[PDB]
Symmetry: C2
Subunit: 359 residues, 2 copies
């Protein structure tokens, strides 16, 4: 039995993903800036193309005002050098006028032939501070506008931030059908839980002991159930996988060995969940750490709870992609959630940018 | 002597450009929808790669809420299939949060190694209406913020729409140096002239008889001079160029031959729509595309018109035609090889010879 009812209860595969490190995220030693691991297009596109070759099924492309690649530019450029991997594009509600966001989503979705998933985030614009309550109300409007673009002939939306009447959706029709691209996002505040329950397809959870993950799932499922919906569930977590547990635990100590700063005595909050990486304030505060078979057993345990998406990362990002991609990924049943959900048409759809008749 | 002082007075070349038709602009017959000419990524990227091979030096990528390609998405994708053509990206002030616009510009500029020019536009967002005065005030703020990103360590901007204090420019440092990417834009209203005089590098003019173009140049130069600046000048115009004038004039009639409009009905069963100058045809204005006239003539007549515009002070030409690929081949094979061409970013010294010491380039990464 899963902790809560999930959208994909008979799916026995998982969408196993990497992380494109677009925001100065890549390191050989945590806290040590390395020019050769900067978030240049050359480096970040290499993470994507390598992840694709290794058989990762999606890749989280973060968005923040840090040295690196604008997320939607990066996704557009990657469309021309990828063929199979999904991309999970962080989009911050309100940062782009939402009708033009819908047109950008339709443009990228046709460039990718439906290999697009969206990570809806609700944080502040760079150099601006807006109250949380307002940011979440604005996120509801932006997502409602996107979902109208994907499903209706016109956008008709009367809200606090935006007001549109009779705006044609023709320039914003995505490649994906049966509802459009999937939304993967998380958050823990009451306002985030309400936005996730009302609008997310995949609820992304940051790493916590399993007892606490179970409560996270019940908390968001109570909001989904109030909207007559179920969710699927994702885990965001760093990765250190090696032939032996000792090699993996030694690598974790190696990663924090230069942090020059002030859990059990070893930084573990659970048998294979290492929070030592939390000292780096990377944005993801824990790693799964163990042998190949231990990491496989942890993935099985998260699957039994109801997790069907894993967004992994490691240090350096290319080197841990190879470890995980060569040791663990061949042993896993993987899927593409857009495909499982029936969003990706087998043939070019009759959209304005596809095979549709021009008017 | 040029009509007005220009920024590039000794330049005897021009930046000769095509148009990527990102907004359902492409037709074989005006007013006749053709599925094969839709603004799909495959079709529009082919206009760009063909324009590059032919030797065009820049290409205008328009931005509007019409079936086609989001401009900055399109430019990012094209970065990976081009190496020498500049791209001229239409950006609408306020449509993206301006700090993230700066970061997007820095991303694209490094993907393109400095082959980016920006067409700053001040029109409404889709589904929205804001008064013209307010849209021009907002355009000043957005351009001011971009120029701070390109020239300063931090953005410090206290304005009506935007207020930023001490925001690092590190995530928004462009590839281009010595002021950053060039801005190409136009407009005729008092507020547009003031924005152009204060902030444009290239003043883009839509097609008019030469005497009126000269008045456009004087009118905007008066605002540039008030800011202690000079501009360079671009002409946006459609193109029909053939071995003989007859073939060209016959093709113009062919392009409007299926247009089921008022004038089309009268002719099938003229002051507004005809030749306003021997080689300037406004009949294409019946199609209500971006651009209401074409240069129409023989190769020799079109070369003569280009030389006449250059003598006035024009150093950029943004051409288009129908179909967009077919007229690129006509112009690109018949006229373009006979022209001295340049890249204005290069003329202006914006493009470093070597990878610059930027955070995305060869710069030292800091924590």
């Amino acid at each position: 039995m899963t902790v809560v009812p999930i959208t994909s209860p008979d799916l026995d595969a998982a969408e196993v993903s990497w992380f494109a490190a677009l925001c100065s995220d890549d390191y050989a030693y945590l806290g040590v800036p390395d020019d050769a691991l900067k978030s240049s297009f050359e480096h970040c596109s290499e993470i994507v193309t390598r992840a694709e070759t290794l058989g990762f099924r999606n890749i989280l492309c973060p968005s923040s005002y840090q040295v690196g690649q604008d997320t939607l530019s990066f996704v557009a450029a990657c469309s021309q050098i990828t063929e199979r991997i999904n991309l999970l594009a962080a989009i911050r509600c309100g940062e782009m006028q939402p009708i033009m966001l819908a047109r950008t989503v339709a443009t990228l979705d046709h460039m990718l032939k439906g290999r697009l998933t969206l990570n809806v985030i609700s944080s502040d614009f760079p150099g601006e501070v807006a109250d949380s309550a307002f940011r979440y109300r604005r996120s509801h409007e932006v997502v409602q506008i996107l979902r109208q673009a994907w499903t209706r002939d016109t956008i008709d939306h009367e809200g606090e931030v935006y007001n549109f009447k009779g705006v044609t959706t023709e320039p914003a029709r995505p490649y994906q059908q049966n509802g459009g691209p999937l939304l993967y996002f998380g958050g823990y505040s009451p306002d985030a839980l309400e936005l996730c329950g009302a609008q997310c397809d995949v609820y992304l959870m940051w790493p916590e002991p399993k007892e606490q993950i179970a409560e996270r799932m019940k908390a968001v499922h109570a909001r989904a159930e109030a909207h007559g919906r179920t969710l699927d569930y994702g885990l965001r977590v760093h990765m250190i996988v090696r032939d032996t547990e000792k090699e993996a635990r030694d690598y974790a100590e190696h990663l924090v060995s230069k942090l020059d700063d002030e859990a059990d005595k070893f930084g573990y909050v659970e048998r294979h969940l290492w929070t030592g990486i939390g000292r780096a304030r990377s944005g993801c505060g824990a790693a799964l750490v163990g042998s190949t078979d231990q990491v496989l057993s942890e993935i099985e345990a998260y699957k039994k709870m109801g997790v069907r998406a894993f967004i992994f990362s490691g240090y350096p990002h290319l080197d841990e992609a190879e470890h995980f991609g060569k040791k663990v990924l061949p042993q896993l049943k993987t899927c593409s959630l857009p495909h499982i959900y029936g969003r990706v048409p087998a043939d070019t759809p009759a959209t304005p940018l596809g095979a549709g008749r021009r008017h």
